[PDB]
Amino acid sequence: HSHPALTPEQKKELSDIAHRIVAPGKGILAADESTGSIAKRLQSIGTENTEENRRFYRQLLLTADDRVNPCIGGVILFHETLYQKADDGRPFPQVIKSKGGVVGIKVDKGVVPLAGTNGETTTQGLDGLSERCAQYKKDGADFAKWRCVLKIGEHTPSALAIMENANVLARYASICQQNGIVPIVEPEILPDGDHDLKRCQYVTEKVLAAVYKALSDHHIYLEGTLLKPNMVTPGHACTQKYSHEEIAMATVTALRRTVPPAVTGVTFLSGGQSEEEASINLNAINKCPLLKPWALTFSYGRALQASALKAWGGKKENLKAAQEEYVKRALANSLACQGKYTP
Amino acid sequence: HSHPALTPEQKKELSDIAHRIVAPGKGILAADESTGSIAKRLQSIGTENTEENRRFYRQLLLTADDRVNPCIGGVILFHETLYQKADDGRPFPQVIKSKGGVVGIKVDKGVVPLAGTNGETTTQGLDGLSERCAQYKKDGADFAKWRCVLKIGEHTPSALAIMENANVLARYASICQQNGIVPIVEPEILPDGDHDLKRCQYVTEKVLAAVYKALSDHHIYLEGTLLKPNMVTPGHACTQKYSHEEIAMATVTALRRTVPPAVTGVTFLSGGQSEEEASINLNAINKCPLLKPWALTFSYGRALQASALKAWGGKKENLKAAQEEYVKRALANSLACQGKYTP
Amino acid sequence: HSHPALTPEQKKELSDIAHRIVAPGKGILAADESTGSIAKRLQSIGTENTEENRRFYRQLLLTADDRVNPCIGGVILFHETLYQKADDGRPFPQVIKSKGGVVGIKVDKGVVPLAGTNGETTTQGLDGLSERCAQYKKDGADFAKWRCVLKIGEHTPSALAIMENANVLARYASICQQNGIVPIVEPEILPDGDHDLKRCQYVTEKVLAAVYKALSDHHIYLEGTLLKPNMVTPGHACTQKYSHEEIAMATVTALRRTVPPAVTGVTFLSGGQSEEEASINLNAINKCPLLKPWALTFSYGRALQASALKAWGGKKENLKAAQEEYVKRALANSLACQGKYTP
Amino acid sequence: HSHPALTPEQKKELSDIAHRIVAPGKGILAADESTGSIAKRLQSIGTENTEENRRFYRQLLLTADDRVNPCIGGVILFHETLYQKADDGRPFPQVIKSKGGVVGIKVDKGVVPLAGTNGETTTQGLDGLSERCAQYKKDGADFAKWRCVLKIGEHTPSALAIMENANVLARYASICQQNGIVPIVEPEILPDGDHDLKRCQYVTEKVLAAVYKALSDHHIYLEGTLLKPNMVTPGHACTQKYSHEEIAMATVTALRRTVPPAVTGVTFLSGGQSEEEASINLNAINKCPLLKPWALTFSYGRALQASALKAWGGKKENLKAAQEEYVKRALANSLACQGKYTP
Known part of the structure; x- marks a missing residue:
C-alpha cells in the first residue's frame, strides 16, 4: 500500500530547503567541477590547475560582497570544495551559509556509456550514495545535483536512455530525500546537432x-525536489534562428506539459550559451505570458563564471575585478529570475 | 522523431474548446447516463423509464433559465440525448450552445473485467471511436467523456489495472483530439472500502x-484536455472523519504532484457524495492555500441532479420546481468553482 | 496478490486447443479475409466479389480431401465465413472439425492510425470482444486471430507503437482466454522498406x-496461446540478398531471445513472400541447428491459397484443380513444418 | 536503430563462457561470501574470522581432487578471494582454471533500501563497474554475479521494487557483457513468509x-548470460507441504513462462534449503516432464559447503574430511543437474 518514504518532518525540511534555494530573486551558482572539468576552464586562461588555484577560484566565487546574497540562493560544490576553507579559515559551506545561500554538492559520479545505444550515456554515482549524502548533510550540504546527460540525434534519445536516466535520477532523488538532502533533478539535454526548437521541445517533453513518472514510481517528494532542465533551445548546428521569445515560449510550454506544480522550482542550466544569452533567455522565460507555477530560477556554471574567470586571469591582482564581474552577472541573473532584467 | 499529432490549428481549436468548458465560474453538467444508469435514478421516484421520460428529464436539465448559463460551461450527453430535441423542436446540442455551454458526449462503452485482477475493470469504447467522434463533432459535441473506474482494495489498484486504464484513456484522448473533440480524462477512483484519506491520496497520485505518463506517450495535447478525477476523500466505510479542509488539501496536493499545468482545468466528479458535500468540497478545494494552476471546476452527475430529480417526481407539475432546484444547485457549484460558496 | 485469471480446467482446455492447433505436422490455414481484403484477391482474376463467390472459394479451401487433414491443424475464418455452410448443408466450422482441424476466427476489427506516429497503426476490436468470443466459442471457433501491424522505418516502430500494439494484443489474449478461446498473438512486422535482415531481427526481438512482457502483465496463460510473428526477413526494397539458411537463423534467434518456451507453438505468417519461398523458409526454420522448444508451424493465407486461387479462376470447372493445388501446397507446408520439405 | 551492443566476436566469447559454465553435468560453486557474510558461517563453528582462515577455507573448497572437476563448471569468488593464492603459491583463479572451471566474481555491492517500500531493497554496485569488470577479466574472472533480493509480503514485491531490481540487473548485465564477462542474472526471491507454492510461482513469473524485459531493453545478449533464480518453493513459514515433484513442476513452469530459451542455462540457488533438499529439488527439476530448453544447473553457496564447513571444524586436521564432504556433495549436485541423482 502506502508506505511513507518520508515522515512529515522530513517532507517539511525538504520543502523548506527547496523553497530557500529558489526563493524569489534567488538562483543557484553551479560551482561543482571535477579536477578535469575545471582543468579546461583554467587552461583557457593559462593558469595551471592546482589545489590552491581551485581553492582560490572557489573562494573568489563564494566570498562575494553583500550584493550577491539576495541573488544566489544555493551553491553547488564539488566534493573537494565542500572541505576547503576560505583565507580567513572559514569553511566554504559556512561561507555559503553566512551569505544566506544553501550549500549543495555534486553527488553524481559522471556518465557511463549505455551499450546498444548511439553513444548515449547514463549517469553513475548511486553506490554508497546514502552514506555520502548523510555525510554531506553533516558537512552542511543541504541539496544535491545529479547531471543526467541526453543528446538529440537521428535515433537519440532512445527509450532505453530516457528510461535509464529517469530511473537513475529517481533513485538519486530517493536517496537524497531519505538523507534529508533536496535532490536537484537534471535531465540535461545536450544542444548538439542541427535539431530545431520544435524537436528540442518534443525531446524535452518526453x-x-x-523523469517525473520515474520520480512518482520511486515515491519522490516533488516539493522537496528541484528541476535543472536544459533550456528548450535549437541545436548549436541548427541553421534556423529563434528569438528569445520563441525559446522562452518553447521552454515554458515544455515545462507546463510535463513538470507537476508540486516541484518547488525550475533552476535552468546555461548549457553552452553565453552569459548574456542565458540571462536574456531566463528573463524571457520569466516574462512568458503562460502561467508558471514554479520558481523559474537559474543554476548556471558558465553563465555566472566565464566573465569572472576571464577578468581573474589566474592572478591575485584581479581578485576584486573578477568578484565584480561575478557579482554583476549574479545581479543580472537574479533580475532575469524575477523577470526584470533589461540589459 | 517529432511527428505532429495535431496541427497548430487543431491545437488552437482544442485549447479554445477546453478553456470554454472550464472558463471561470463555469463547470460541467454530467447529464450522461445510459438506459440502465438512469433507470436506477428514475426508479427511485417510481416513474417508469421511457424514451419520452428520459427526453423530458434531459430537457428539464438543459432548458433551465438564464441564471444557469454562467454556471454550466459544458454538458455531457448520452448518445441518444445528443439526437433528441426540446419541446420546441430545438435540438439538445443546440439548446446547450444557445446557453453558452459546450456540448459533450459519453464515448466510452462501459467497463469490462480485467482477467487476473481482484475485480478490477478496464473501459472499452475504442472501436470505431474515430468515426464516432467525427460524427459527434458534426452533431455539435465538442468534448468527450471516458469514465475509467478504479477502486482501492488490499491489492487494488494493481499495476495492470492502472497501466491499462491509463493506456485506454490515452488512446481515447488521442482519438478525440484527432477528431477535434476535447477529451476529458476521467481516471475515477471509487471511494469504496475503509481506506483513509492518505491512501486515497497515494492511489490518486499513482x-x-x-495517466499523464500515458498521455505523454500517446502525444496527447494536454492543453486540449480536461481532467475528471475523483476528489481525494476517505472511503465510504472509513471510520476516521476528515474535514472539508483536509479533503481539499489532499485533493489539491494530489493534483499538484501529478497533473501538469498544461491541463486546461480539473473538473471534479461527485463520486457518491451529497450535493452539499460536493459543493463544499469544491469550494474548499478552490480555497486551498496551495497555488492551483488549473481551473478547478465541477463535472457533477448526481451532485447537480439529485435534488432536481426528487423535486421533479416524474410528473410535469413540478417542472418549474425542479428547474429552480437544479439552477440553484448549479449556482452553488459555480460559486464553489470560484471559491465563493458560503452555504 | 495472485488472482487466477483462469481455473486449472480453463488452462487445460486452452492448452489442449493450442496443442491441437500446432500438433506435429499440422499448421494453420489463414482463410480470414474481410470483404475488401478478399476483394483484391478475387479482382486479380476478374471474378466479381459476391457472397456466393466468397462462400464457394472458402468451401473449396475447406472441403479438401483426406490428404489435407494431417497438414491443417487449424483454420482461421472471417466472421461471415463462420456462419456459412458447405454445398451439402454442412456448416463451415463443422466441416473444419470433421477434418480434424480447429476452427478459428478473426476477432480484430482492423488497424487504426496512432496519432503522433509516422504512419504507425494500432489494432482495434476489443469492444464487446468478450461477448463476441463467447458467441464464437458457441459457434465452434476454438481460437482467435488478432493482426497487429508494425512496420520498419527510419523512426519506426516507435516506443508508443510497440507498447500500444503489445498492450492491445495482451488485452485481446486475456479476453479470448477468459472466453475459452486460444488467442493467436500476431505482432506482424511489415517487410516494407530497405531494412536488412539484422534490423528486422532487432525490431522483431524488441x-x-x-509483446510477451505485456502478456505477462495481463496474466496471459502462454500455454493457451500461439504466436504468429513475421519471419525475420529483409525488407522488400533491401538490395542485400539473404539465403534461406540466414533467414531461418535470424528468425529462430529472434524467437529464442524473446518467446518463452511456454508458448505452445509459433505459427509463422507468409508476409508477402511467394508460396515456395514461404515453404522453403519454414523448412529452413525447422531445420535450424538451434534448439526450438515450440512447434514451428505455418499460418499462411497467401502462401497456401495463391496458386489455388489462380488455378480456380473463379469458375466451377477448375474446382478439382484448385483443390489439388491447395492440397499439395498444404502438404509442402506440413513437410516444412516437420522440417522434411525437399522441393 | 540497431546499434550492436556487442560485436560477433564478443557474442561468441560470451556464449562460449556461458556454455562452459553450465556445460552438462557441471554447476557453479558460490564461494562469494563477504567478510561479514562468511563471519556467521565461521561463527557457527567457533573459529575466528581472519584473512588466513578465509583463505584456507576457500582453498579447501577450491583445491579438491580431480573427481570434483566435471561437477563444478564455475566458481564465484569474492573480491579478496580472487587475489589470494593456494598453499603452493598458485592463485585461486588459476586453481579454478586448472580444474576446468570458470572463474567468477561477485560484482554487486549489496542491497540498499528502497524508499516508500515495505522493507524492499535494491542492489548497488554499478559505480565503476566497467573498470572493475575489466580488471576482473584481466584477473581471470570470466563471469560475474549480481544478487538482487526480493521478498514476498502482503504488498511485496511492489512494481517499483521489481522494476528497479530488473533495471539494475540489466545495467549490470550490460556492463559485464561490454567487459567480456558473462553476467549471471540473479533476481532472487526470498522464501520468507507463509506464502504458498502458487504465490511463489506467480511472483517468480512476474x-x-x-527481468527479461529489462534485459531486452538494455540490449543484453541473453546467450552470454545465465540466470540464478530462486527455486519456486513455499515460504519458510508456509504450513502447507509440497512434494519435490510439485516444487519442480512450479519452478520449471515459472521458468518456461518467462525465461527465453536463448539463455544459456539456469543455475538455481539453494535459498535456505538443506543440501539434500536442494539436490533433490534440482534432480526433480531436471526430471520434470516439461521440455526444458536450458541447462538447469546449480549455483549453490550453502547447499555445497554447509556440511563441508561443519566437517572442517576450523582446524587443519579435517582438511581431507571436509574436501571429501564437499566433493561428494558436488557429485550429488552434478547428478541432480543431469537428473540422475538417486540418494
Missing part, C-alpha cells in the same frame, strides 16, 4: 515526462 | 502520474 | 519482448 | 518477466 524526457521530463519520463 | 493513478494520475500513470 | 516487438516480441514487449 | 519478476522473471520484468
Whole structure:
C-alpha cells in the first residue's frame, strides 16, 4: 500500500530547503567541477590547475560582497570544495551559509556509456550514495545535483536512455530525500546537432515526462525536489534562428506539459550559451505570458563564471575585478529570475 | 522523431474548446447516463423509464433559465440525448450552445473485467471511436467523456489495472483530439472500502502520474484536455472523519504532484457524495492555500441532479420546481468553482 | 496478490486447443479475409466479389480431401465465413472439425492510425470482444486471430507503437482466454522498406519482448496461446540478398531471445513472400541447428491459397484443380513444418 | 536503430563462457561470501574470522581432487578471494582454471533500501563497474554475479521494487557483457513468509518477466548470460507441504513462462534449503516432464559447503574430511543437474 518514504518532518525540511534555494530573486551558482572539468576552464586562461588555484577560484566565487546574497540562493560544490576553507579559515559551506545561500554538492559520479545505444550515456554515482549524502548533510550540504546527460540525434534519445536516466535520477532523488538532502533533478539535454526548437521541445517533453513518472514510481517528494532542465533551445548546428521569445515560449510550454506544480522550482542550466544569452533567455522565460507555477530560477556554471574567470586571469591582482564581474552577472541573473532584467 | 499529432490549428481549436468548458465560474453538467444508469435514478421516484421520460428529464436539465448559463460551461450527453430535441423542436446540442455551454458526449462503452485482477475493470469504447467522434463533432459535441473506474482494495489498484486504464484513456484522448473533440480524462477512483484519506491520496497520485505518463506517450495535447478525477476523500466505510479542509488539501496536493499545468482545468466528479458535500468540497478545494494552476471546476452527475430529480417526481407539475432546484444547485457549484460558496 | 485469471480446467482446455492447433505436422490455414481484403484477391482474376463467390472459394479451401487433414491443424475464418455452410448443408466450422482441424476466427476489427506516429497503426476490436468470443466459442471457433501491424522505418516502430500494439494484443489474449478461446498473438512486422535482415531481427526481438512482457502483465496463460510473428526477413526494397539458411537463423534467434518456451507453438505468417519461398523458409526454420522448444508451424493465407486461387479462376470447372493445388501446397507446408520439405 | 551492443566476436566469447559454465553435468560453486557474510558461517563453528582462515577455507573448497572437476563448471569468488593464492603459491583463479572451471566474481555491492517500500531493497554496485569488470577479466574472472533480493509480503514485491531490481540487473548485465564477462542474472526471491507454492510461482513469473524485459531493453545478449533464480518453493513459514515433484513442476513452469530459451542455462540457488533438499529439488527439476530448453544447473553457496564447513571444524586436521564432504556433495549436485541423482 502506502508506505511513507518520508515522515512529515522530513517532507517539511525538504520543502523548506527547496523553497530557500529558489526563493524569489534567488538562483543557484553551479560551482561543482571535477579536477578535469575545471582543468579546461583554467587552461583557457593559462593558469595551471592546482589545489590552491581551485581553492582560490572557489573562494573568489563564494566570498562575494553583500550584493550577491539576495541573488544566489544555493551553491553547488564539488566534493573537494565542500572541505576547503576560505583565507580567513572559514569553511566554504559556512561561507555559503553566512551569505544566506544553501550549500549543495555534486553527488553524481559522471556518465557511463549505455551499450546498444548511439553513444548515449547514463549517469553513475548511486553506490554508497546514502552514506555520502548523510555525510554531506553533516558537512552542511543541504541539496544535491545529479547531471543526467541526453543528446538529440537521428535515433537519440532512445527509450532505453530516457528510461535509464529517469530511473537513475529517481533513485538519486530517493536517496537524497531519505538523507534529508533536496535532490536537484537534471535531465540535461545536450544542444548538439542541427535539431530545431520544435524537436528540442518534443525531446524535452518526453524526457521530463519520463523523469517525473520515474520520480512518482520511486515515491519522490516533488516539493522537496528541484528541476535543472536544459533550456528548450535549437541545436548549436541548427541553421534556423529563434528569438528569445520563441525559446522562452518553447521552454515554458515544455515545462507546463510535463513538470507537476508540486516541484518547488525550475533552476535552468546555461548549457553552452553565453552569459548574456542565458540571462536574456531566463528573463524571457520569466516574462512568458503562460502561467508558471514554479520558481523559474537559474543554476548556471558558465553563465555566472566565464566573465569572472576571464577578468581573474589566474592572478591575485584581479581578485576584486573578477568578484565584480561575478557579482554583476549574479545581479543580472537574479533580475532575469524575477523577470526584470533589461540589459 | 517529432511527428505532429495535431496541427497548430487543431491545437488552437482544442485549447479554445477546453478553456470554454472550464472558463471561470463555469463547470460541467454530467447529464450522461445510459438506459440502465438512469433507470436506477428514475426508479427511485417510481416513474417508469421511457424514451419520452428520459427526453423530458434531459430537457428539464438543459432548458433551465438564464441564471444557469454562467454556471454550466459544458454538458455531457448520452448518445441518444445528443439526437433528441426540446419541446420546441430545438435540438439538445443546440439548446446547450444557445446557453453558452459546450456540448459533450459519453464515448466510452462501459467497463469490462480485467482477467487476473481482484475485480478490477478496464473501459472499452475504442472501436470505431474515430468515426464516432467525427460524427459527434458534426452533431455539435465538442468534448468527450471516458469514465475509467478504479477502486482501492488490499491489492487494488494493481499495476495492470492502472497501466491499462491509463493506456485506454490515452488512446481515447488521442482519438478525440484527432477528431477535434476535447477529451476529458476521467481516471475515477471509487471511494469504496475503509481506506483513509492518505491512501486515497497515494492511489490518486499513482493513478494520475500513470495517466499523464500515458498521455505523454500517446502525444496527447494536454492543453486540449480536461481532467475528471475523483476528489481525494476517505472511503465510504472509513471510520476516521476528515474535514472539508483536509479533503481539499489532499485533493489539491494530489493534483499538484501529478497533473501538469498544461491541463486546461480539473473538473471534479461527485463520486457518491451529497450535493452539499460536493459543493463544499469544491469550494474548499478552490480555497486551498496551495497555488492551483488549473481551473478547478465541477463535472457533477448526481451532485447537480439529485435534488432536481426528487423535486421533479416524474410528473410535469413540478417542472418549474425542479428547474429552480437544479439552477440553484448549479449556482452553488459555480460559486464553489470560484471559491465563493458560503452555504 | 495472485488472482487466477483462469481455473486449472480453463488452462487445460486452452492448452489442449493450442496443442491441437500446432500438433506435429499440422499448421494453420489463414482463410480470414474481410470483404475488401478478399476483394483484391478475387479482382486479380476478374471474378466479381459476391457472397456466393466468397462462400464457394472458402468451401473449396475447406472441403479438401483426406490428404489435407494431417497438414491443417487449424483454420482461421472471417466472421461471415463462420456462419456459412458447405454445398451439402454442412456448416463451415463443422466441416473444419470433421477434418480434424480447429476452427478459428478473426476477432480484430482492423488497424487504426496512432496519432503522433509516422504512419504507425494500432489494432482495434476489443469492444464487446468478450461477448463476441463467447458467441464464437458457441459457434465452434476454438481460437482467435488478432493482426497487429508494425512496420520498419527510419523512426519506426516507435516506443508508443510497440507498447500500444503489445498492450492491445495482451488485452485481446486475456479476453479470448477468459472466453475459452486460444488467442493467436500476431505482432506482424511489415517487410516494407530497405531494412536488412539484422534490423528486422532487432525490431522483431524488441516487438516480441514487449509483446510477451505485456502478456505477462495481463496474466496471459502462454500455454493457451500461439504466436504468429513475421519471419525475420529483409525488407522488400533491401538490395542485400539473404539465403534461406540466414533467414531461418535470424528468425529462430529472434524467437529464442524473446518467446518463452511456454508458448505452445509459433505459427509463422507468409508476409508477402511467394508460396515456395514461404515453404522453403519454414523448412529452413525447422531445420535450424538451434534448439526450438515450440512447434514451428505455418499460418499462411497467401502462401497456401495463391496458386489455388489462380488455378480456380473463379469458375466451377477448375474446382478439382484448385483443390489439388491447395492440397499439395498444404502438404509442402506440413513437410516444412516437420522440417522434411525437399522441393 | 540497431546499434550492436556487442560485436560477433564478443557474442561468441560470451556464449562460449556461458556454455562452459553450465556445460552438462557441471554447476557453479558460490564461494562469494563477504567478510561479514562468511563471519556467521565461521561463527557457527567457533573459529575466528581472519584473512588466513578465509583463505584456507576457500582453498579447501577450491583445491579438491580431480573427481570434483566435471561437477563444478564455475566458481564465484569474492573480491579478496580472487587475489589470494593456494598453499603452493598458485592463485585461486588459476586453481579454478586448472580444474576446468570458470572463474567468477561477485560484482554487486549489496542491497540498499528502497524508499516508500515495505522493507524492499535494491542492489548497488554499478559505480565503476566497467573498470572493475575489466580488471576482473584481466584477473581471470570470466563471469560475474549480481544478487538482487526480493521478498514476498502482503504488498511485496511492489512494481517499483521489481522494476528497479530488473533495471539494475540489466545495467549490470550490460556492463559485464561490454567487459567480456558473462553476467549471471540473479533476481532472487526470498522464501520468507507463509506464502504458498502458487504465490511463489506467480511472483517468480512476474519478476522473471520484468527481468527479461529489462534485459531486452538494455540490449543484453541473453546467450552470454545465465540466470540464478530462486527455486519456486513455499515460504519458510508456509504450513502447507509440497512434494519435490510439485516444487519442480512450479519452478520449471515459472521458468518456461518467462525465461527465453536463448539463455544459456539456469543455475538455481539453494535459498535456505538443506543440501539434500536442494539436490533433490534440482534432480526433480531436471526430471520434470516439461521440455526444458536450458541447462538447469546449480549455483549453490550453502547447499555445497554447509556440511563441508561443519566437517572442517576450523582446524587443519579435517582438511581431507571436509574436501571429501564437499566433493561428494558436488557429485550429488552434478547428478541432480543431469537428473540422475538417486540418494
